Symmetry: C3
Subunit: 136 residues, 3 copies
């Protein structure tokens, strides 16, 4: 229920110090993304930080998009979610996948190099052709 998606590695630690993203089970809908950091980053309550993944994708098919969402436990239990809430990746975006991380909780939290911090899903998207009407 695949679609081949081209991926390029931007940081030499990817696949060496921490693995490439993989589906945990065959019924899994998302892939976990990990923090490609040189040093751990401490987020006080309310802070946001942009975390690199060391990866770039090229979806290429305009009928597909990817969405980045918070990991469920981390968001619910530690208040570690995305600063833009939900990240949308277009079929033509070819830059590095960067994760906006926001501490919406009451406690400081430290992101460690290689920690899984977000999940990404691939969903079909439709481009609307607007038909202007004066009344429905």
């Amino acid at each position: 229920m695949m679609k081949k998606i081209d991926v390029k590695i931007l940081d030499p630690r990817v696949g060496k110090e921490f693995p490439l993203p993989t589906y945990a089970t065959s019924g899994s809908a998302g892939l976990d993304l990990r923090a490609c950091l040189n040093d751990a980053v401490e987020l006080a309550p309310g802070d946001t930080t942009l975390v690199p993944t060391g990866l770039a994708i090229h979806i290429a098919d305009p009928s597909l998009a990817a969405m980045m969402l918070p990991r469920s436990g981390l968001g619910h239990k530690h208040g570690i979610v995305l600063g833009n809430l939900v990240g949308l990746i277009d079929s033509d975006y070819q830059g590095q996948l960067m994760i906006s991380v926001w501490n919406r909780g009451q406690d400081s939290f430290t992101i460690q190099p290689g920690e899984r911090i977000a999940q990404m899903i691939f969903v079909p998207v439709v481009q609307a052709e607007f038909n202007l009407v004066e009344d429905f």
Copy 2:
């Protein structure tokens, strides 16, 4: 535009004290989920709580996933949203549907037993097969 989805009832009050989820209209995209609580829960500004639904689903088809989102009025007018922002349910998750509720507002809010507190949609998902390239 259905797909039959297996559902199991975990709490005897479901369908008795509050009904099973149903689509409001035939053009409705989501189903409202209700709080299966013994007692009302009061959320001060900033608090989060995990609310049981008394329900479990088994999507089973790996081409489909479900997403849980805030109810629009409650989120915009009362600041009652999800602590993990958007909840993703995999085709192989078979445990109880649990809702992470967060009061992102300035006022306390009390969740009453049986109140509709989130909505869920079923969307097609694609599993990516990564093709490693050195350049796009």
Copy 3:
């Protein structure tokens, strides 16, 4: 990869003072929505406001829904996101598209008339037919 969607203009400034929504590129997944305001609105940290778009859509096909999400830069860099996090538009909703805007940041921000403040995507949705089982 279109679907024709009926659109009705509710405010005479739309298409005159600021253009109708358009896909930036042919591989773009979302459309940016702009604030249809008479006066700029200043949001202090924590405030929410409901912003009209001057537009109404009628999806009409029950197999499609639209989702409204924060713009990535504005959400990550200025803390300007949606108060209901993610807005869902049903195939039968025919009222004006209204955007719940929340300042989740630490600074005040002023929304100017015509500014792009959210993005919308059209995604296929499936209506579940529940099959009650006592065990999976």
